[PDB]
Amino acid sequence: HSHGLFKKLGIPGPTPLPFLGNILSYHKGFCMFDMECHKKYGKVWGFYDGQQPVLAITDPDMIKTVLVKECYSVFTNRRPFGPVGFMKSAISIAEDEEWKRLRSLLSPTFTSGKLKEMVPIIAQYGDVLVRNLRREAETGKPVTLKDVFGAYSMDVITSTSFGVNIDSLNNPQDPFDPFFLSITVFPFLIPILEVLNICVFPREVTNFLRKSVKRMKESDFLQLMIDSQNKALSDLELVAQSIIFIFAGYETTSSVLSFIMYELATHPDVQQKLQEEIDAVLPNKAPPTYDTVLQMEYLDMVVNETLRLFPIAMRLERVCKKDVEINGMFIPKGVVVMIPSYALHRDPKYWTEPEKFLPERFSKKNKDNIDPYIYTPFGSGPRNCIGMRFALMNMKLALIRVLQNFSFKPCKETQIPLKLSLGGLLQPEKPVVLKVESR
Amino acid sequence: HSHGLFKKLGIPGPTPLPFLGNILSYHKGFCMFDMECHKKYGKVWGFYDGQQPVLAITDPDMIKTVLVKECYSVFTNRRPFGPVGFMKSAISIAEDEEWKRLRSLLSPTFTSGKLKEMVPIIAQYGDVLVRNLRREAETGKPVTLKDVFGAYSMDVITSTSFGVNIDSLNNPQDPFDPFFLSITVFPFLIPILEVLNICVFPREVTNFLRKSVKRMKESDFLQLMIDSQNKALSDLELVAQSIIFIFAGYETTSSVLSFIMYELATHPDVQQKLQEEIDAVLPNKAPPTYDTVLQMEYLDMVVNETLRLFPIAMRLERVCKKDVEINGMFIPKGVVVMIPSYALHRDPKYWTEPEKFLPERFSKKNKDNIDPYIYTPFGSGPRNCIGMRFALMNMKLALIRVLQNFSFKPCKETQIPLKLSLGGLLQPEKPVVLKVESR
Ligand code: HEM
Ligand code: HEM
Ligand SMILES: CC(C)(C)OC(=O)N[C@H](CSC[C@@H](Nc1ccccc1)C(=O)NCc1cccnc1)Cc1ccccc1
Ligand SMILES: CC(C)(C)OC(=O)N[C@H](CSC[C@@H](Nc1ccccc1)C(=O)NCc1cccnc1)Cc1ccccc1
User: Fold this and answer.
1) Which CATH number fits domain B1-439: 3.40.50.720, 3.30.160.20, 1.10.630.10, 3.90.1150.10?
2) Where is heme bound in this sequence (chains A, B)?
């Protein structure tokens, strides 16, 4: 390279192979690679995704500098992603000024008031979620959580943002490590693939929407995007935000729900202690409300501690858009700065027994011993997760309604312990199946 | 180029643009381009798909030389197709020796005896095809032919080759001009896309089968591929033939059926004259049989004359694998030789009133005035359509059973006349909808 950079900076790290960089080390997944490098190299280290240098940082102050103090000036954008096509205008993917604009356009969607307007609406699909669960529990047949969870998550996302109601067991649309591997050795092929219309998003899954958002409709977040469009928001740019929002609210929601239900099943005392709180705040199986959801502290602790063990983003990243010297360390233009959330969430130098599910970690007696720059399931700074309050609410409303009616036990075919997918993303190897018993 | 070749051979043709070749001329579709060049240039002409020279030939003798006399020696293979992936081992796509082998392996599937074994089996889905039609005709609601036709075509293909029965209105699997355009200017990008696993066949449609043929099953054409495997046939090569066969039997069958039913609807005398023959050969709505299907001469004439107007392959092609001088014309190595079937099927120098639907053209009084090297809906020579006798049978069995119960009239929203898709393939612009009346 270009494989001399960290050598030259005196920054330690795994020796890269030509072209490949360190990427063969991903044979155990991002997260094990990160954990290993943390323990081998300490607070800071560098590696190469192909020819791209990545600096991992683990100092809280330095992380606050990157995500917060110097965001607009230096660390505004994430690693180039391609080929994306018209999805370049998607907010999680857009850069500099354009992202600032979309962030401004879309921010007022998750105010405490717009959220609070959605609790009445969400309250309907929880009842479908239960009734669907009530059938596969009267029939003692183990249940695939992500199926009925994603169906619920799908139902919430299409109607909180657009207005479309579907009982996701008609199986309505749904979209979807062989190839992104070739990206990292061949990032030069991204501009190639762009001119080919080639997309990591199959052109058919997007064409299903390239009209279906125009096919919505029309005369909620979709409302809020024309009402704020009234330098304003295009319509192929509006479709792009819709795609982001539908994915995020479907996949992350369903998947974190599956993780929580696994933890409750292998820790029955935590499941019961939570069911008792729900019944004390919502007695007679009372319907949750925006304000009772926010009152349940143990539900929050359970949500948080699961997100400690399964930070589904895994890593946070920012591109260095110019030479800087943050907290005494020189960082050259073009380096990707990465925060290894999975690794920091499991660091024994911050967390007692860091692999155990222990929600007391987030008790108000203990929540202050926790550095918001070590615990980052939603990122931080101006580019943190815009859907955070919606996600926590949506999940908690789901959990409340579900633990109000059912208990969850392991099955013969439950994977205990749970292996993580040694692949690209943060999911289990085998899917989560548990016995569901009616209260 | 390389854009001097035809200039140098004294062969006439449209002047190519740099890089693009003649490809902007496709703005009206292959078929109009071919027809135009035929009338402008005569019997032989050349053009460039990007930098690739294509020689069109229209002399019957020369066409017989190419497709028949010199097939194994010179004109064994079709234009390189990519990126294909494991689909390179598919018979329509494979080359030289390997194609010879697969052609030998797979040929005995459509013997008159293996076909005859399938008439009993096919006879079941025709009855589903009718009963499905009987519902949308008791409800005077116009019908989309290709929907119920493809459902039938799907049902026939999965069970004639594997053994799987599905009432294709549960909507069972089904797989599927933006990008192949970039191929022709960038064929150099094909080896690029191969190393990227990138496929013109979405990796998910094939993964749905990359196991589903292994998921078939196992302890018919699928039978005949292990029984002949017993230099033998692999299993990822077996999947590849399955994919070819499922497509061909689904899409071509459904689409030619739609074309025939359009012609019968806009020519009611032909529809009646056919219904009379079916009732004379199969009286009391008798079930068709292998031998009665072959007896109906007007049904054959109707099938043939539709295939004259809609040759769904459009063009036949062979790569020149070495310098030759066929019928007095020198052809250099690497040129694609193309036979413009659509253009020859509509040549007024061979066909009276060539745009009219006139099935008498194929009467036994007139069928001999027709050059099998001008009329080529199934290609010709050792690389002709291997599924021809199956296709004609399958369609004719469908037509018999359907015209035995229903008549077909135009609708308010029937496109008359029918526009062809000015796009890539030979399909109508709008889909075919007709009124269906119960006899
Ligand atoms: C449990 C659920 C979720 C988790 C753990 C999560 C986590 C994250 C993380 C870690 C980031 C990157 C933050 C950073 O770089 O500092 C992010 C960004 C983002 N998230 Fe989420 N997320 C969740 C659900 C959602 C939902 C439901 C939406 C709804 C639209 C959403 C929308 C976004 C967007 C648009 C971004 C990019 C923000 C920007 O660049 O301005 N997320 N999320
Ligand atoms: C109305 C229906 C069909 C029409 C008009 C049609 C037409 C054609 C044509 C024009 C060719 C190229 C011949 C050449 O280059 O000389 C071809 C090849 C082929 N057809 Fe069909 N076809 C039909 C249905 C089918 C079906 C149902 C199958 C079932 C598997 C099939 C299998 C194939 C294969 C495998 C090839 C490549 C043959 C080889 O290279 O050895 N076709 N077809
Ligand atoms: C393993 C998971 C998936 C859990 O995580 C990731 O691997 N991470 C993503 C990789 S896909 C980029 C894009 N997906 C997309 C998906 C479909 C059609 C177009 C686009 C995205 O931005 N999605 C929003 C999001 C996802 C998750 C949480 N919240 C918000 C990168 C990313 C994550 C978070 C914020 C920004 C970017
Ligand atoms: C407009 C139409 C489609 C009617 O026609 C074409 O454009 N023609 C094809 C282009 S796709 C090559 C491949 N499809 C495929 C489709 C899906 C998964 C993998 C592969 C093929 O070979 N199919 C068999 C076939 C199709 C039609 C008739 N009979 C047999 C080229 C071709 C045609 C005929 C023989 C060989 C090659």
Assistant:
1) 1.10.630.10
2) 385
